[PDB]
């Protein structure tokens, strides 16, 4: 739906994770290579999203949600 | 006739051997190494894929009404690659006879539960899991039964020390009961008691 | 009319009360609880001495550790003791409670209740004859006879 | 090289299960620091969860992973329900175990242990 | 005035006992002692949650029966009246209607507890 | 064979007398009055309570309580450090260290018993081939300290030198039954 405010909330949650360094943070940064993350610190981010927007989402998807833009599109498609 | 030795009757031996032939030729797909002992006891060894069929047949079949699960055990033999010898001792009230069914498992080779057959096995299988580490399938609530709520290890495994790895005490600093590594004031004394002279030549293991 | 003499007599009275009225707690773990019962039985009438089993720790004055203390049970024992109000005494009954006993080298036994709570009196046996547990109760009575708390307060 | 699988026919499905379990623990920690009146924060609990998870990161057999997940779900049940008290939860933190050093030389100064 | 006196004396006796019970003894307070009691282990929840009631209908009925008792209590005076037939008839009607209501409840299984 | 405990009930026959009897039972509380009568009878009986610690509970020579090491009438110790007592002690409570006494005899230096591990089973006194270790009759040996309950050679020897007059007689009584 609203790909602009969605993205604001998403980048906010990202900054709030407090495990990443904002230097390489963007709307298409790669959690693993760019920001230096792994599987579980991505699970945590996607669950922070679940909280923010309240809509519970599977793992079959939270696994492919590998960059903020994919989060934005998944939030937009479901909501 | 002799007063110290134990009176021995072959009639029960014959009965149990005939019934063992019965079971073996009625469940060939699962049965292995039926055998009967000097003391009159029937032991039917099987492949674990046959647990539920065998036990259901022995409970429901007419000439075999073993519908009371007395016990359900395990036996660690670290030598063989499949250590745990799971045992099902059963009882027929209609024939006043008992029988024992055995399978084999491993640390990473679980078997099926029989709570669908004998509800008495819920807690016994929980006990097997807690004590040896054998996992059962389709168990309603498989958790610990006897060990502490945060206990690591399966104590009845021969590889587990009699005294464990931790030890509990109360610490005023934290005001709680805490777990610290074991440290004993007197160490358990291991007595080598096996006589070096063959005692029963009927069980001699040829080299 | 010395205040020290008056305080000694007052302490005698305090201890007489806290002693002739010892309400233990219904806390029995293993076999030794049977001898506890038998010490509650006609032959050895506890109430005859003022002893009364109250089931709430908030009303009890002493707890007899009557049997084996496993690691899964020690937290509850320490909690109950903590919940008993001072003055609170403890009695270890049997060999399981004192030093683990026949299960000393087990992975699921605390080798002594004196690790989890502080113990005033140790009653040996497996099980201790109810007569022996009574001997221990009276030993505790005397230990209380020798508390001398108010004398200490006056000497401070 | 051929064996029977417990649940997962490969390591990826076992990883799916492991992730489900991580989510469950991450969501539960706050409720049990509230209920059990633990004197720790919510961040310490999740760091401890992650550490206990990494403690077995080296595994590659899906059967070991399945059994580890079963044990973790057992513990998560024991914790969601209050069958276990704050004692068993704080056992994880080892607040009293004097931390043995990994320096060869300190291990040399105190005792004969390697 | 004397009733006030006696009742206040009792208030004061009780309060004196409680004062000397809360200020005489030596205390040592800490959380593990002041915590609730649930048979050695920690509570799984608060005791301030809905504790379902299975005799709610019987309690409601008890209210009305208490009122019927309130209406029966003036008999010691109603028997000093000239119109005795009326008092007799009204008391009988009251008690009979009470019993009939109780019987209807009984039969329809109100006095039995929800399970 | 077998018997029924609550199937005695047969087909129902009822009279006016039976109905009235059951009615009186239900209205006058007959069966409860009988329990009242029993409790009353017990009030006028002699209580089984002994006056401890003045009059005490009975016992038998075989009673196995506190341990003691005995001696021969010459004063020499009976123990020879054969170690059956610690070899069988199923609680691993006994601890022994032997050494040739200066006169050359086989005797102990250490003989310790953790009376917090002893289960008071008696195996040690039936294993001792010299009737040295015994389980005496004393049971009134409670303490205020755990350490006091860790006996050594001197404590057991003193107990033996304290109870011999009783241990020996109880043995003399019981040793034919063994
Ligand atoms: C109808 C009901 C009838 C029953 C109620 C009748 C009860 C009347 C009892 C009269 C006895 C009065 C003395 C009781 C004092 C006991 C309190 C106590 O033990 O505390 C010790 C305390 C301990 O003092 P302390 O200074 O040594 O404490 C040091 C700190 N601790 C304890 C942590 C080590 O002694 C007193 O201070 C009390 C002094 C006695 C006079 C008090 C008035
Ligand atoms: C012309 C006449 C006109 C006048 C009209 C009156 C005529 C006379 C009528 C007499 C009626 C008898 C008296 C009524 C009282 C008894 C009421 C009663 O029977 O209750 C019985 C009740 C049920 O018993 P149950 O066996 O379970 O049967 C259940 C039904 N199927 O179970 C009970 O209620 C009893 C169980 C109670 C147990 C508690 C312990 C009792 C202790 C007993 C102590 C006895 C000492 C009494 C002392 C009294 C001194 C004040
Ligand atoms: S000391 Fe003996 S009698 Fe007492 S609880 Fe332990 S085993 Fe049972
Ligand atoms: S009585 Fe039994 S447990 Fe006690 S010291 Fe002798 S052998 Fe050991
Ligand atoms: S069995 Fe008797 S003689 Fe042998 S070591 Fe023990 S006490 Fe000494």
XYZ file of N, CA and C and ligand atoms in Angstrom, chain F residues 79-85 96 111 128-129 132-133, ligand 5:
47
model
N 40.635 -56.319 65.972
C 40.766 -56.048 64.550
C 42.153 -56.426 64.059
N 42.194 -57.009 62.866
C 43.419 -57.446 62.221
C 43.569 -56.848 60.832
N 42.744 -55.865 60.491
C 42.806 -55.213 59.191
C 42.650 -56.224 58.060
N 41.558 -56.980 58.113
C 41.205 -57.875 57.025
C 40.342 -57.183 55.982
N 39.595 -56.160 56.392
C 38.931 -55.219 55.499
C 37.683 -55.788 54.844
N 37.155 -56.898 55.356
C 35.838 -57.342 54.917
C 34.778 -56.297 55.234
N 34.897 -55.646 56.391
C 33.887 -54.683 56.809
C 33.742 -53.551 55.804
N 39.984 -47.744 56.112
C 40.970 -48.468 56.898
C 42.346 -48.269 56.283
N 40.777 -46.306 61.179
C 39.519 -47.039 61.088
C 38.417 -46.012 61.306
N 33.052 -59.548 60.099
C 34.227 -59.596 60.954
C 34.432 -61.011 61.480
N 35.544 -61.672 61.153
C 35.774 -63.031 61.654
C 36.307 -63.094 63.074
N 35.081 -58.168 66.172
C 35.700 -56.922 66.608
C 34.762 -55.736 66.422
N 34.341 -55.489 65.190
C 33.366 -54.444 64.923
C 31.981 -54.987 65.230
S 36.177 -57.150 59.421
Fe 36.822 -56.955 61.612
S 38.994 -57.681 61.640
Fe 38.464 -57.273 59.444
S 39.153 -55.114 59.089
Fe 36.942 -55.008 59.682
S 36.969 -54.692 61.955
Fe 39.067 -55.403 61.365
